[PDB]
Structure 1
Amino acid sequence: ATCADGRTTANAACCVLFPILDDIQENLFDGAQCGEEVHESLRLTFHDAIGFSPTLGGGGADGSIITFDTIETNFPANAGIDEIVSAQKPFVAKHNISAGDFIQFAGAVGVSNCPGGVRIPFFLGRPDAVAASPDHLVPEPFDSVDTILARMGDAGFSAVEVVWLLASHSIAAADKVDPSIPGTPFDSTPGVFDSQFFIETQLKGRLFPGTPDNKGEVQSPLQGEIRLQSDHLLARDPQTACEWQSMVNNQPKIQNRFAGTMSKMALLGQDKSKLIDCSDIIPTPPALVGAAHLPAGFSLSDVEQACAETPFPALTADPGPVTSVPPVPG
């Protein structure tokens, strides 16, 4: 098909996405950058989609977190999501796609702006949300590993799929875990979709980057990096540790598994055969920058080996003394 301005797409319903793409790239993502709004938009894909259970209910990736914002943004597990919901709302109102479609589209577009990123398949045609998600369907960083894995399992994901989705934490920061240090990333490269998250979570902890005693947090290996309790434990648990380690220095696996599992997440509560493929709209991401490494000052002895089948790979360390990670600009 050929759209209004001459750009082409396989299925013509998808032409509606071109003006939306242009608009969000300029006016939501600050000129196609991999920064705070991209990261928050990716977080939103999960907080919308995971509100799905075959028995507890919820419509999954249905836009409910926007349409029923006054209910959902008040769930404890959704703390801080109100900012990005408020930012996306006027875009949904202005454009001609459902809220569910918009959230997944914006996430996919955003990930495609990040160096090292991947093109996530994107489907059009989710109907409007019917009801708010039930509460207590979004995992929390202080939930037991088995609780997180069961919740994700209930939604349809294997333990290895949870690991692949958590590649998202390679382009990610926290504002509410430790409110004294908002914008503190989960890896040293929050502007690059890379394996540093999987590496740096495997290191022995050293310090709290801000205050002690925050729920859902444990010690981090680096000033200016924060470590979730859940991420600490998933890197070490027998169900997930070998898969976690397998991501290290394997950019093509990170990309391919993230794209496939994000597609599956984007379709929770939906039927792919009742939607239209608009994957060819997503831009081509920039190339990976940087290579897999231990942080400056670290060595292999600082890695906590938790995969029983295979030792952690030796990686070279950046040169020089231990440095600290800059926060993500708000």
Structure 2
Amino acid sequence: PTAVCSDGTRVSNAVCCDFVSLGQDLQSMVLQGDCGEDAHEIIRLTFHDAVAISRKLGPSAGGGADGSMLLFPLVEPEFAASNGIDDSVNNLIPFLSLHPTISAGDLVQFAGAVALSNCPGAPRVQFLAGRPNHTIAAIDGLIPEPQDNVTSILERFDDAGGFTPFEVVSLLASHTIARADKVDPTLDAAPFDTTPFTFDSQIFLEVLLKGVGFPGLDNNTGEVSSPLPLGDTSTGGKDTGLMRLQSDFALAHDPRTACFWQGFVDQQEFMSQSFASAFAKLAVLGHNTDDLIDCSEVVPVPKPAVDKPTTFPATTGPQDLELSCLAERFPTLSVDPGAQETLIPHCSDGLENCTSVQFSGPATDSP
């Protein structure tokens, strides 16, 4: 039966109402309404928590979206594939006691939904509640790494939850708001696209440009050359140059995924809807949706997509593209004016001095 919540929201089930105050606390205490560092790491955690599940190995290998990352913070966060995930994990642990009617699995996925809503252009994702509050730690080896090839990547997603190559590329839209802190031991927050605080299709276009150099070292595992490597870090600045993952490069050029990859370029609505569909499927891995309840209405309405069209970043152009998809012509797009590479801002407000909430906690990371 229906009820209305404290902020006035109509809900199909009154047990959805407990998520209202949780969302408010996630914003006030961690996310701060920003599509910033803390939001990005929390979105990354939804994937690390959910994908640790295997059809072929059976339930003992992992329970998927079950909050195992939070309930066993001394196990999975410290596996090599998850180096750096401790930040999100430690930020979320306190909410377990603060909102004890909400399972760790629900907490992770709801935090991800709220985090996404802070990012201009992101979809309002489905949110189902009712994941059980108990599980066990997954085994190591279930999380794809940037050095993995496409066959491996596709097999892992298929084994986790029957994701198709389209769904995999759709999920990787998330790298439109992604940066790397661990891939290069000399770099902090190296962005994967020129708008890491905007949920747009720049990532799809920019992975297709010819690489020309590196923002840091030239020999990091899982990293390939970037088309826009220049930053201001060599002189003490925080605007790290753009980084490209080997896995993104490979997905953009593999015959199984290349057309899906390019298909999202300058297709904002198609990209956000496709991400939303694949993400909703990721969010319930390890669960039958019949055992869950629909609490989608308590997901905040996201910031709207920006006005700006998809364009070539300064100093780049269509002549720099490496195309692989024969089925669809790459669209004609404007080029941003400028003779020099434009620094990619370290903060959503365009400055370099922003700071982020970080709670201390039991999960740890390595350099």
Instruction: Give the TM-score range, shorter chain.
Output: over 0.9
Check if 1:315 corresponds to 2:333. yes
Could you tell me which of 8, 32, 36 is aligned with 2:10? Answer: 8
Check if 1:39 corresponds to 2:40. yes
Give me the whole-angstrom Cα distance separating, in 1, the residues matched to 2:135 and 2:187: 37
Contact 2:31/2:38 (CA < 8 Å) preserved in 1? yes
Give me the whole-angstrom Cα distance separating, in 2, the residues matched to 1:326 and 1:14: 37
Runs of at least 5 residues in structure 2 that lack an aligned partner in the other structure: 231-240, 348-353, 356-367
1:1-330 → structure 2 map (5 Å cutoff): 1-4=3-6, 6-30=8-32, 32-56=33-57, 57-95=61-99, 96-155=101-160, 156-222=162-228, 223=230, 224-289=241-306, 290-321=308-339, 322-328=341-347
Contact 1:13/1:276 (CA < 8 Å) preserved in 2? no
Residue 145 of structure 1 deviates from its aligned partner by: 1.3
Give me the whole-angstrom Cα distance separating, in 1, the residues matched to 2:49 and 2:134: 11
The amino acid that maps onto 2:155 is A
The amino acid that maps onto 2:320 is D
Give me the whole-angstrom Cα distance separating, in 2, the residues matched to 1:226 and 1:295: 14
Give me the whole-angstrom Cα distance separating, in 2, the residues matched to 1:27 and 1:102: 14
Give me the whole-angstrom Cα distance separating, in 2, the residues matched to 1:205 and 1:69: 37
- Structure 1 SS opposite 2:78: coil
The amino acid that maps onto 2:292 is L
Contact 2:192/2:244 (CA < 8 Å) preserved in 1? yes
Contact 1:305/1:311 (CA < 8 Å) preserved in 2? no
Q: Deviations over 1:44-65 (max 9, x none)?
A: 0000000011122310000001
Contact 2:53/2:63 (CA < 8 Å) preserved in 1? yes
- Structure 2 SS opposite 1:107: helix
- Provide the TM-score with structure 1 as the length reference: 0.97
How many residues align? The count is 329
Q: Deviations over 1:296-328 (max 9, x none)?
A: 122211010111222322211101123232335
Contact 2:9/2:298 (CA < 8 Å) preserved in 1? no
Contact 2:208/2:252 (CA < 8 Å) preserved in 1? yes
Residue 98 of structure 1 deviates from its aligned partner by: 0.3
- 1:21/1:301 Cα in 2 relative to 1: closer, same or farther (>3 Å)? same
Residue 12 of structure 1 deviates from its aligned partner by: 1.0
Give me the whole-angstrom Cα distance separating, in 2, the residues matched to 1:299 and 1:218: 20
* Percent identical: 49
Give me the whole-angstrom Cα distance separating, in 2, the residues matched to 1:2 and 1:309: 49
Runs of at least 5 residues in structure 1 that lack an aligned partner in the other structure: none
Contact 2:52/2:138 (CA < 8 Å) preserved in 1? yes
Residue 5 of structure 1 deviates from its aligned partner by: 5.5
Residue 4 of structure 1 deviates from its aligned partner by: 4.5
The amino acid that maps onto 1:297 is T
Give me the whole-angstrom Cα distance separating, in 2, the residues matched to 1:309 and 1:7: 45
